[PDB]
Amino acid sequence: MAEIKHYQFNVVMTCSGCSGAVNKVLTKLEPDVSKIDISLEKQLVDVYTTLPYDFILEKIKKTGKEVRSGKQL
């Protein structure tokens, strides 16, 4: 029933990242993830996956990049 959510987080990219690290840490659960997307402009990242929010936060945490806020859609 609960499928691919669309989470969105304000993650401090500050140049450089361009999916590196953020993508890699998700590869581990490709079969549970639809996609990620990234918008440098407003330092936003979308995470399209069925996995629980907490799990995503953990994985983002694991990159070492700051996370100012985020929500689910």
Short mmCIF file of all heavy atoms in Angstrom, two decimals:
data_model
loop_
_atom_site.label_atom_id
_atom_site.label_comp_id
_atom_site.label_asym_id
_atom_site.label_seq_id
_atom_site.Cartn_x
_atom_site.Cartn_y
_atom_site.Cartn_z
N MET A 1 0.85 -1.21 0.00
CA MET A 1 0.00 0.00 0.00
C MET A 1 0.87 1.25 0.00
O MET A 1 0.86 2.01 -0.95
CB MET A 1 -0.96 0.06 1.20
CG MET A 1 -2.16 -0.88 1.09
SD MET A 1 -3.48 -0.44 2.25
CE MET A 1 -4.72 -1.69 1.84
N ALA A 2 1.64 1.45 1.08
CA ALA A 2 2.62 2.51 1.11
C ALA A 2 3.77 2.12 0.17
O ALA A 2 4.36 1.06 0.35
CB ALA A 2 3.08 2.72 2.56
N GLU A 3 4.00 2.93 -0.86
CA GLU A 3 4.92 2.67 -1.95
C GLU A 3 6.03 3.72 -1.90
O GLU A 3 6.23 4.36 -0.87
CB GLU A 3 4.10 2.71 -3.25
CG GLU A 3 3.20 1.47 -3.33
CD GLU A 3 2.02 1.62 -4.28
OE1 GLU A 3 1.80 2.75 -4.77
OE2 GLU A 3 1.35 0.59 -4.49
N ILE A 4 6.75 3.90 -3.01
CA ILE A 4 7.71 4.97 -3.26
C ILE A 4 7.14 6.30 -2.74
O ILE A 4 6.28 6.89 -3.39
CB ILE A 4 8.00 4.99 -4.78
CG1 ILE A 4 8.59 3.65 -5.26
CG2 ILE A 4 8.96 6.14 -5.12
CD1 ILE A 4 8.61 3.48 -6.78
N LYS A 5 7.62 6.78 -1.59
CA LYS A 5 7.37 8.14 -1.13
C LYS A 5 8.26 9.06 -1.92
O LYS A 5 9.19 8.60 -2.59
CB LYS A 5 7.74 8.32 0.36
CG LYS A 5 6.56 8.07 1.28
CD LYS A 5 6.12 6.62 1.11
CE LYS A 5 5.24 6.20 2.27
NZ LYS A 5 3.93 6.88 2.25
N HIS A 6 8.02 10.35 -1.76
CA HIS A 6 8.92 11.40 -2.20
C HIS A 6 9.25 12.21 -0.95
O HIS A 6 8.47 13.06 -0.51
CB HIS A 6 8.22 12.18 -3.31
CG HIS A 6 8.91 13.42 -3.78
ND1 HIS A 6 10.09 13.95 -3.30
CD2 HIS A 6 8.32 14.37 -4.57
CE1 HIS A 6 10.15 15.22 -3.74
NE2 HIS A 6 9.10 15.52 -4.52
N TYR A 7 10.41 11.95 -0.36
CA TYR A 7 10.93 12.78 0.70
C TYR A 7 11.68 13.93 0.03
O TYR A 7 12.10 13.78 -1.12
CB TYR A 7 11.83 11.95 1.62
CG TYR A 7 11.11 10.80 2.28
CD1 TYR A 7 11.32 9.47 1.86
CD2 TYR A 7 10.17 11.06 3.29
CE1 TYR A 7 10.61 8.42 2.47
CE2 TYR A 7 9.46 10.01 3.90
CZ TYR A 7 9.69 8.69 3.50
OH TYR A 7 8.98 7.68 4.08
N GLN A 8 11.81 15.05 0.73
CA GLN A 8 12.58 16.19 0.28
C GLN A 8 13.30 16.77 1.49
O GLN A 8 12.66 16.99 2.52
CB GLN A 8 11.64 17.21 -0.36
CG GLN A 8 12.45 18.38 -0.91
CD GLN A 8 11.65 19.30 -1.80
OE1 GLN A 8 12.20 20.14 -2.51
NE2 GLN A 8 10.33 19.19 -1.76
N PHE A 9 14.61 17.02 1.37
CA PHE A 9 15.43 17.57 2.45
C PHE A 9 16.21 18.77 1.95
O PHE A 9 16.68 18.77 0.82
CB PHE A 9 16.39 16.53 3.05
CG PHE A 9 15.77 15.18 3.35
CD1 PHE A 9 15.57 14.27 2.30
CD2 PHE A 9 15.42 14.83 4.67
CE1 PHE A 9 14.96 13.03 2.56
CE2 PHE A 9 14.81 13.59 4.92
CZ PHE A 9 14.58 12.69 3.87
N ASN A 10 16.37 19.78 2.81
CA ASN A 10 17.30 20.87 2.63
C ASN A 10 18.66 20.43 3.17
O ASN A 10 18.87 20.44 4.39
CB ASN A 10 16.78 22.12 3.35
CG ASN A 10 17.45 23.35 2.75
OD1 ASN A 10 18.28 24.00 3.38
ND2 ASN A 10 17.08 23.63 1.52
N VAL A 11 19.55 20.00 2.28
CA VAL A 11 20.85 19.43 2.62
C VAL A 11 21.92 20.38 2.09
O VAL A 11 21.89 20.76 0.93
CB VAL A 11 20.96 17.99 2.06
CG1 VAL A 11 20.57 17.91 0.58
CG2 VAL A 11 22.37 17.39 2.21
N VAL A 12 22.86 20.79 2.95
CA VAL A 12 23.85 21.78 2.54
C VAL A 12 24.87 21.10 1.63
O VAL A 12 25.77 20.40 2.09
CB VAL A 12 24.46 22.49 3.76
CG1 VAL A 12 25.40 23.62 3.30
CG2 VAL A 12 23.35 23.12 4.62
N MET A 13 24.70 21.30 0.32
CA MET A 13 25.56 20.78 -0.73
C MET A 13 26.87 21.57 -0.74
O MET A 13 27.94 20.98 -0.72
CB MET A 13 24.85 20.90 -2.09
CG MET A 13 24.68 19.55 -2.79
SD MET A 13 23.39 18.45 -2.15
CE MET A 13 21.92 19.48 -2.42
N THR A 14 26.73 22.90 -0.83
CA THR A 14 27.81 23.85 -1.10
C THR A 14 28.76 23.34 -2.19
O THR A 14 29.91 22.99 -1.94
CB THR A 14 28.45 24.34 0.21
OG1 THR A 14 29.38 25.38 -0.04
CG2 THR A 14 29.12 23.26 1.07
N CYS A 15 28.27 23.33 -3.44
CA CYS A 15 29.04 22.93 -4.62
C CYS A 15 29.40 21.44 -4.55
O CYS A 15 28.83 20.71 -3.73
CB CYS A 15 30.28 23.84 -4.75
SG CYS A 15 30.77 24.01 -6.48
N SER A 16 30.34 20.96 -5.38
CA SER A 16 31.10 19.73 -5.18
C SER A 16 30.32 18.42 -5.32
O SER A 16 30.65 17.61 -6.18
CB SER A 16 31.87 19.80 -3.86
OG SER A 16 32.66 20.98 -3.83
N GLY A 17 29.34 18.17 -4.45
CA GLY A 17 28.73 16.86 -4.26
C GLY A 17 28.25 16.23 -5.57
O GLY A 17 28.65 15.11 -5.89
N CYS A 18 27.36 16.93 -6.28
CA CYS A 18 26.76 16.50 -7.55
C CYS A 18 26.47 15.00 -7.55
O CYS A 18 27.09 14.21 -8.26
CB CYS A 18 27.65 16.92 -8.72
SG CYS A 18 26.73 16.63 -10.25
N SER A 19 25.56 14.58 -6.66
CA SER A 19 25.14 13.19 -6.49
C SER A 19 26.20 12.28 -5.87
O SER A 19 25.83 11.27 -5.27
CB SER A 19 24.56 12.61 -7.79
OG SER A 19 23.53 13.46 -8.27
N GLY A 20 27.49 12.58 -5.96
CA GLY A 20 28.50 11.76 -5.30
C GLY A 20 28.24 11.71 -3.79
O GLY A 20 27.68 12.63 -3.21
N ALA A 21 28.60 10.58 -3.18
CA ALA A 21 28.32 10.23 -1.79
C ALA A 21 26.83 9.95 -1.57
O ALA A 21 26.46 8.84 -1.20
CB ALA A 21 28.87 11.27 -0.80
N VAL A 22 25.97 10.94 -1.83
CA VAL A 22 24.52 10.84 -1.63
C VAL A 22 23.93 9.69 -2.45
O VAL A 22 23.10 8.94 -1.95
CB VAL A 22 23.87 12.20 -1.97
CG1 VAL A 22 22.36 12.14 -1.71
CG2 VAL A 22 24.46 13.34 -1.13
N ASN A 23 24.37 9.53 -3.70
CA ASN A 23 23.95 8.43 -4.54
C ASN A 23 24.56 7.14 -3.99
O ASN A 23 23.85 6.17 -3.74
CB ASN A 23 24.42 8.71 -5.97
CG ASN A 23 24.18 7.52 -6.87
OD1 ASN A 23 23.13 7.38 -7.48
ND2 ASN A 23 25.20 6.68 -6.97
N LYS A 24 25.88 7.13 -3.81
CA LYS A 24 26.62 5.96 -3.37
C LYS A 24 25.98 5.34 -2.13
O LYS A 24 25.70 4.15 -2.12
CB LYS A 24 28.09 6.32 -3.13
CG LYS A 24 28.89 6.39 -4.44
CD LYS A 24 30.39 6.50 -4.14
CE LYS A 24 31.22 6.32 -5.42
NZ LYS A 24 32.67 6.32 -5.15
N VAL A 25 25.73 6.12 -1.09
CA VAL A 25 25.17 5.59 0.15
C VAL A 25 23.79 4.94 -0.07
O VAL A 25 23.41 4.05 0.68
CB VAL A 25 25.22 6.66 1.25
CG1 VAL A 25 24.08 7.68 1.14
CG2 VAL A 25 25.22 6.05 2.65
N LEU A 26 23.06 5.35 -1.12
CA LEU A 26 21.79 4.74 -1.48
C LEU A 26 21.97 3.48 -2.34
O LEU A 26 21.06 2.65 -2.32
CB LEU A 26 20.84 5.74 -2.17
CG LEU A 26 20.27 6.87 -1.29
CD1 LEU A 26 18.77 7.02 -1.57
CD2 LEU A 26 20.41 6.69 0.23
N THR A 27 23.09 3.28 -3.05
CA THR A 27 23.23 2.11 -3.93
C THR A 27 22.90 0.81 -3.18
O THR A 27 22.24 -0.08 -3.70
CB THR A 27 24.64 2.00 -4.54
OG1 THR A 27 25.63 1.84 -3.55
CG2 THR A 27 24.97 3.17 -5.46
N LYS A 28 23.36 0.75 -1.93
CA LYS A 28 23.16 -0.37 -1.02
C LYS A 28 21.70 -0.86 -0.99
O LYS A 28 21.47 -2.03 -0.73
CB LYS A 28 23.64 0.04 0.39
CG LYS A 28 24.34 -1.12 1.11
CD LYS A 28 25.76 -1.32 0.57
CE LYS A 28 26.48 -2.45 1.31
NZ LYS A 28 27.84 -2.68 0.79
N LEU A 29 20.74 0.04 -1.22
CA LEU A 29 19.32 -0.26 -1.22
C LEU A 29 18.63 0.23 -2.50
O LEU A 29 17.44 0.50 -2.48
CB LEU A 29 18.68 0.21 0.11
CG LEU A 29 19.38 1.38 0.83
CD1 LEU A 29 18.97 2.75 0.30
CD2 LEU A 29 19.05 1.30 2.32
N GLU A 30 19.35 0.21 -3.64
CA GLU A 30 18.74 0.34 -4.96
C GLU A 30 17.40 -0.42 -5.10
O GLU A 30 16.41 0.21 -5.44
CB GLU A 30 19.71 -0.08 -6.07
CG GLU A 30 20.75 1.01 -6.38
CD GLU A 30 20.67 1.49 -7.83
OE1 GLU A 30 20.72 0.62 -8.72
OE2 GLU A 30 20.57 2.73 -8.02
N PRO A 31 17.32 -1.73 -4.82
CA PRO A 31 16.06 -2.46 -4.99
C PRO A 31 14.90 -1.94 -4.13
O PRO A 31 13.76 -2.33 -4.37
CB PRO A 31 16.39 -3.93 -4.70
CG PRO A 31 17.65 -3.86 -3.84
CD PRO A 31 18.37 -2.64 -4.41
N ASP A 32 15.17 -1.07 -3.14
CA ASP A 32 14.16 -0.45 -2.28
C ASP A 32 13.97 1.04 -2.61
O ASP A 32 13.15 1.73 -1.99
CB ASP A 32 14.60 -0.64 -0.82
CG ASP A 32 13.56 -1.38 0.01
OD1 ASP A 32 12.42 -0.87 0.09
OD2 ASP A 32 13.93 -2.44 0.57
N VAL A 33 14.73 1.58 -3.56
CA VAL A 33 14.77 3.00 -3.88
C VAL A 33 14.36 3.19 -5.34
O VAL A 33 14.78 2.43 -6.22
CB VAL A 33 16.18 3.56 -3.60
CG1 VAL A 33 16.35 4.99 -4.11
CG2 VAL A 33 16.47 3.56 -2.09
N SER A 34 13.55 4.21 -5.62
CA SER A 34 13.18 4.55 -6.98
C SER A 34 14.25 5.46 -7.57
O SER A 34 14.75 5.19 -8.66
CB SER A 34 11.80 5.22 -6.98
OG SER A 34 11.28 5.34 -8.29
N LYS A 35 14.57 6.56 -6.88
CA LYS A 35 15.54 7.54 -7.36
C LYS A 35 15.87 8.55 -6.25
O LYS A 35 15.30 8.49 -5.16
CB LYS A 35 15.01 8.25 -8.62
CG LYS A 35 16.04 8.42 -9.74
CD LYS A 35 16.32 7.07 -10.40
CE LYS A 35 17.32 7.19 -11.56
NZ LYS A 35 17.62 5.88 -12.18
N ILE A 36 16.78 9.46 -6.56
CA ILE A 36 17.12 10.65 -5.81
C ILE A 36 17.01 11.77 -6.85
O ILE A 36 17.16 11.47 -8.04
CB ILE A 36 18.57 10.58 -5.29
CG1 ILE A 36 18.91 9.24 -4.61
CG2 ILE A 36 18.86 11.70 -4.28
CD1 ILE A 36 19.17 8.13 -5.63
N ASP A 37 16.80 13.02 -6.44
CA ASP A 37 17.13 14.15 -7.29
C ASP A 37 17.73 15.26 -6.44
O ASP A 37 17.62 15.19 -5.22
CB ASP A 37 15.89 14.65 -8.05
CG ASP A 37 16.28 15.26 -9.39
OD1 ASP A 37 17.40 15.81 -9.47
OD2 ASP A 37 15.47 15.14 -10.33
N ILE A 38 18.38 16.24 -7.05
CA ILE A 38 19.16 17.26 -6.36
C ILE A 38 18.98 18.62 -7.02
O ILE A 38 19.09 18.73 -8.24
CB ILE A 38 20.65 16.87 -6.32
CG1 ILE A 38 20.82 15.35 -6.18
CG2 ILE A 38 21.36 17.65 -5.20
CD1 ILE A 38 22.22 14.92 -5.75
N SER A 39 18.73 19.66 -6.23
CA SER A 39 18.59 21.04 -6.69
C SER A 39 19.50 21.94 -5.86
O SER A 39 19.08 22.48 -4.83
CB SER A 39 17.13 21.47 -6.63
OG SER A 39 16.36 20.69 -7.53
N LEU A 40 20.74 22.11 -6.33
CA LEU A 40 21.76 22.99 -5.79
C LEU A 40 21.18 24.36 -5.41
O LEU A 40 21.44 24.83 -4.30
CB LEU A 40 22.88 23.16 -6.82
CG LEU A 40 23.79 21.93 -6.90
CD1 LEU A 40 24.20 21.66 -8.36
CD2 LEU A 40 25.05 22.13 -6.05
N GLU A 41 20.42 24.98 -6.32
CA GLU A 41 19.86 26.32 -6.17
C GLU A 41 19.38 26.63 -4.75
O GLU A 41 19.75 27.64 -4.16
CB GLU A 41 18.65 26.47 -7.09
CG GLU A 41 18.89 26.46 -8.60
CD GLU A 41 17.53 26.49 -9.29
OE1 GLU A 41 16.63 27.20 -8.77
OE2 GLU A 41 17.37 25.74 -10.28
N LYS A 42 18.50 25.77 -4.22
CA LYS A 42 17.90 25.93 -2.91
C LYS A 42 18.44 24.87 -1.94
O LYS A 42 17.88 24.68 -0.86
CB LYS A 42 16.36 25.86 -3.02
CG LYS A 42 15.76 27.09 -3.72
CD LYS A 42 15.41 26.83 -5.20
CE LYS A 42 15.05 28.15 -5.91
NZ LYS A 42 14.57 27.93 -7.29
N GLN A 43 19.55 24.21 -2.30
CA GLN A 43 20.18 23.16 -1.52
C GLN A 43 19.17 22.07 -1.14
O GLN A 43 19.16 21.59 0.00
CB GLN A 43 20.86 23.81 -0.30
CG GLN A 43 21.91 24.85 -0.72
CD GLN A 43 23.21 24.21 -1.16
OE1 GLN A 43 24.06 23.86 -0.35
NE2 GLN A 43 23.39 24.02 -2.46
N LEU A 44 18.32 21.67 -2.09
CA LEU A 44 17.29 20.67 -1.87
C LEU A 44 17.74 19.33 -2.45
O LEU A 44 18.47 19.31 -3.45
CB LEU A 44 15.95 21.10 -2.49
CG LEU A 44 15.31 22.31 -1.77
CD1 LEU A 44 14.26 22.96 -2.68
CD2 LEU A 44 14.65 21.91 -0.45
N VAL A 45 17.29 18.22 -1.86
CA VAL A 45 17.43 16.88 -2.40
C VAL A 45 16.08 16.19 -2.27
O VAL A 45 15.49 16.25 -1.20
CB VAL A 45 18.55 16.13 -1.66
CG1 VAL A 45 18.16 15.61 -0.28
CG2 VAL A 45 19.10 14.96 -2.48
N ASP A 46 15.61 15.53 -3.33
CA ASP A 46 14.45 14.66 -3.28
C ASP A 46 14.97 13.24 -3.12
O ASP A 46 16.00 12.91 -3.70
CB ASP A 46 13.67 14.73 -4.59
CG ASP A 46 13.02 16.06 -4.91
OD1 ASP A 46 13.08 16.97 -4.06
OD2 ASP A 46 12.40 16.09 -6.00
N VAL A 47 14.25 12.40 -2.38
CA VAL A 47 14.59 10.99 -2.24
C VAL A 47 13.30 10.21 -2.45
O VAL A 47 12.36 10.35 -1.67
CB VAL A 47 15.25 10.70 -0.89
CG1 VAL A 47 15.85 9.29 -0.92
CG2 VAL A 47 16.38 11.69 -0.58
N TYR A 48 13.24 9.44 -3.54
CA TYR A 48 12.06 8.72 -3.96
C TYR A 48 12.26 7.25 -3.58
O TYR A 48 13.02 6.54 -4.24
CB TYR A 48 11.86 8.89 -5.47
CG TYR A 48 11.60 10.32 -5.90
CD1 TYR A 48 12.68 11.18 -6.20
CD2 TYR A 48 10.28 10.78 -6.08
CE1 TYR A 48 12.43 12.49 -6.65
CE2 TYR A 48 10.04 12.09 -6.53
CZ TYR A 48 11.11 12.97 -6.75
OH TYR A 48 10.85 14.26 -7.09
N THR A 49 11.60 6.78 -2.51
CA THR A 49 11.81 5.44 -1.96
C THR A 49 10.68 5.07 -1.02
O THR A 49 10.01 5.96 -0.49
CB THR A 49 13.16 5.36 -1.22
OG1 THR A 49 13.32 4.09 -0.61
CG2 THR A 49 13.27 6.41 -0.12
N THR A 50 10.46 3.77 -0.82
CA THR A 50 9.44 3.26 0.10
C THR A 50 9.98 3.17 1.53
O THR A 50 9.20 3.15 2.49
CB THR A 50 8.89 1.94 -0.45
OG1 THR A 50 7.76 1.52 0.28
CG2 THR A 50 9.93 0.82 -0.50
N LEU A 51 11.31 3.13 1.70
CA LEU A 51 11.94 3.04 3.00
C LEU A 51 11.46 4.15 3.96
O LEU A 51 11.18 5.26 3.51
CB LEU A 51 13.45 3.18 2.80
CG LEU A 51 14.07 2.04 1.99
CD1 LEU A 51 15.48 2.46 1.61
CD2 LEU A 51 14.08 0.72 2.78
N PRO A 52 11.37 3.88 5.27
CA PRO A 52 10.90 4.86 6.24
C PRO A 52 11.85 6.06 6.34
O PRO A 52 13.07 5.88 6.38
CB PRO A 52 10.79 4.12 7.58
CG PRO A 52 11.63 2.85 7.41
CD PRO A 52 11.63 2.59 5.90
N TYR A 53 11.27 7.26 6.43
CA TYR A 53 11.92 8.56 6.61
C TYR A 53 13.21 8.49 7.44
O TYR A 53 14.27 8.89 6.96
CB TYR A 53 10.88 9.49 7.25
CG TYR A 53 11.29 10.93 7.48
CD1 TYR A 53 11.63 11.77 6.40
CD2 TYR A 53 11.13 11.49 8.76
CE1 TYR A 53 11.73 13.16 6.58
CE2 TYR A 53 11.27 12.87 8.95
CZ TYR A 53 11.57 13.71 7.87
OH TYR A 53 11.73 15.04 8.11
N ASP A 54 13.12 7.96 8.66
CA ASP A 54 14.24 7.77 9.58
C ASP A 54 15.43 7.12 8.88
O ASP A 54 16.57 7.57 9.01
CB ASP A 54 13.81 6.90 10.77
CG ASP A 54 12.87 7.62 11.72
OD1 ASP A 54 13.10 8.82 11.97
OD2 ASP A 54 11.92 6.94 12.18
N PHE A 55 15.16 6.06 8.12
CA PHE A 55 16.18 5.35 7.37
C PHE A 55 16.87 6.30 6.40
O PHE A 55 18.10 6.33 6.33
CB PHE A 55 15.56 4.14 6.64
CG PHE A 55 16.41 2.90 6.72
CD1 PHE A 55 16.44 2.17 7.93
CD2 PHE A 55 17.18 2.46 5.63
CE1 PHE A 55 17.20 1.00 8.03
CE2 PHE A 55 17.92 1.27 5.72
CZ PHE A 55 17.93 0.54 6.92
N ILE A 56 16.09 7.10 5.67
CA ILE A 56 16.67 8.03 4.71
C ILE A 56 17.55 9.02 5.48
O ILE A 56 18.71 9.20 5.12
CB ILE A 56 15.62 8.75 3.84
CG1 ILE A 56 14.93 7.82 2.83
CG2 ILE A 56 16.31 9.84 3.01
CD1 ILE A 56 14.06 6.77 3.50
N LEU A 57 17.01 9.64 6.54
CA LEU A 57 17.77 10.58 7.35
C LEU A 57 19.12 9.98 7.75
O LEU A 57 20.14 10.61 7.50
CB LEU A 57 17.00 10.99 8.60
CG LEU A 57 15.82 11.90 8.25
CD1 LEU A 57 14.66 11.64 9.21
CD2 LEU A 57 16.23 13.38 8.30
N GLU A 58 19.14 8.78 8.33
CA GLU A 58 20.35 8.04 8.61
C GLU A 58 21.36 8.02 7.45
O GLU A 58 22.54 8.34 7.63
CB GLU A 58 19.95 6.61 9.01
CG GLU A 58 20.07 6.46 10.52
CD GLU A 58 21.53 6.19 10.87
OE1 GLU A 58 21.98 5.05 10.58
OE2 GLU A 58 22.26 7.11 11.29
N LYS A 59 20.92 7.60 6.27
CA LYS A 59 21.75 7.50 5.09
C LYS A 59 22.31 8.87 4.70
O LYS A 59 23.50 9.00 4.43
CB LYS A 59 20.96 6.87 3.93
CG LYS A 59 21.17 5.36 3.78
CD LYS A 59 20.54 4.48 4.88
CE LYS A 59 21.52 3.99 5.97
NZ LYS A 59 21.30 2.57 6.30
N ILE A 60 21.46 9.90 4.70
CA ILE A 60 21.92 11.26 4.43
C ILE A 60 22.97 11.65 5.48
O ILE A 60 24.06 12.11 5.13
CB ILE A 60 20.76 12.26 4.32
CG1 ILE A 60 19.82 11.82 3.18
CG2 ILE A 60 21.30 13.66 4.03
CD1 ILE A 60 18.63 12.75 2.99
N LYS A 61 22.67 11.41 6.77
CA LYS A 61 23.58 11.62 7.88
C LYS A 61 24.94 11.02 7.55
O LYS A 61 25.97 11.68 7.68
CB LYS A 61 23.03 10.96 9.16
CG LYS A 61 22.87 11.91 10.34
CD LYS A 61 21.65 12.83 10.20
CE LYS A 61 21.25 13.45 11.55
NZ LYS A 61 20.60 12.47 12.45
N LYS A 62 24.94 9.76 7.10
CA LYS A 62 26.16 9.03 6.80
C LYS A 62 27.06 9.74 5.77
O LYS A 62 28.26 9.47 5.76
CB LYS A 62 25.85 7.58 6.39
CG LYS A 62 26.07 6.58 7.54
CD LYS A 62 25.03 6.69 8.66
CE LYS A 62 25.47 5.84 9.87
NZ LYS A 62 24.42 5.75 10.91
N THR A 63 26.54 10.64 4.93
CA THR A 63 27.40 11.37 3.99
C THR A 63 28.24 12.44 4.70
O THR A 63 29.22 12.91 4.13
CB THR A 63 26.59 12.03 2.87
OG1 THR A 63 25.85 13.14 3.34
CG2 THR A 63 25.66 11.02 2.18
N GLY A 64 27.82 12.88 5.89
CA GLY A 64 28.46 13.97 6.61
C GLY A 64 27.95 15.35 6.18
O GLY A 64 28.36 16.34 6.79
N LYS A 65 27.09 15.46 5.17
CA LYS A 65 26.52 16.75 4.80
C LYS A 65 25.40 17.15 5.76
O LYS A 65 24.58 16.31 6.14
CB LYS A 65 26.01 16.74 3.35
CG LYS A 65 27.20 16.77 2.38
CD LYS A 65 26.72 16.99 0.94
CE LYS A 65 27.85 17.48 0.02
NZ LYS A 65 29.12 16.76 0.23
N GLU A 66 25.37 18.43 6.14
CA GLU A 66 24.32 19.01 6.96
C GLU A 66 22.94 18.84 6.33
O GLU A 66 22.80 18.84 5.11
CB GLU A 66 24.58 20.51 7.13
CG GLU A 66 24.94 20.85 8.57
CD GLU A 66 23.65 21.02 9.37
OE1 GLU A 66 22.90 20.03 9.42
OE2 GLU A 66 23.41 22.16 9.82
N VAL A 67 21.95 18.78 7.21
CA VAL A 67 20.53 18.58 6.92
C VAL A 67 19.74 19.57 7.76
O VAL A 67 19.52 19.35 8.95
CB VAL A 67 20.11 17.12 7.22
CG1 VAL A 67 18.61 16.93 6.95
CG2 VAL A 67 20.89 16.14 6.34
N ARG A 68 19.31 20.67 7.14
CA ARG A 68 18.69 21.76 7.87
C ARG A 68 17.25 21.41 8.26
O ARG A 68 16.77 21.79 9.32
CB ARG A 68 18.73 23.06 7.07
CG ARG A 68 20.10 23.27 6.42
CD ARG A 68 20.28 24.74 6.03
NE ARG A 68 20.72 25.52 7.19
CZ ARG A 68 20.71 26.86 7.28
NH1 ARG A 68 20.22 27.60 6.28
NH2 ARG A 68 21.21 27.46 8.37
N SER A 69 16.54 20.73 7.36
CA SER A 69 15.14 20.33 7.48
C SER A 69 14.85 19.34 6.36
O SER A 69 15.66 19.20 5.44
CB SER A 69 14.23 21.55 7.32
OG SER A 69 14.24 22.39 8.46
N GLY A 70 13.69 18.69 6.39
CA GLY A 70 13.16 17.91 5.31
C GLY A 70 11.79 17.44 5.76
O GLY A 70 11.47 17.48 6.94
N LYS A 71 10.99 17.02 4.80
CA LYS A 71 9.63 16.54 4.97
C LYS A 71 9.33 15.46 3.94
O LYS A 71 10.15 15.18 3.06
CB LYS A 71 8.64 17.71 4.89
CG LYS A 71 8.88 18.66 3.70
CD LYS A 71 9.37 20.04 4.17
CE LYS A 71 8.19 20.87 4.72
NZ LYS A 71 8.64 22.11 5.39
N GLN A 72 8.14 14.86 4.08
CA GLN A 72 7.63 13.85 3.15
C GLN A 72 6.49 14.43 2.33
O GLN A 72 5.77 15.31 2.80
CB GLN A 72 7.20 12.59 3.91
CG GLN A 72 5.79 12.70 4.47
CD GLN A 72 5.46 11.61 5.47
OE1 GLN A 72 6.20 10.66 5.67
NE2 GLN A 72 4.29 11.74 6.08
N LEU A 73 6.34 13.89 1.13
CA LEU A 73 5.30 14.13 0.17
C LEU A 73 4.80 12.73 -0.25
O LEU A 73 3.58 12.60 -0.44
CB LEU A 73 5.89 14.89 -1.03
CG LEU A 73 6.82 16.04 -0.63
CD1 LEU A 73 7.68 16.43 -1.82
CD2 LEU A 73 6.09 17.26 -0.10
#
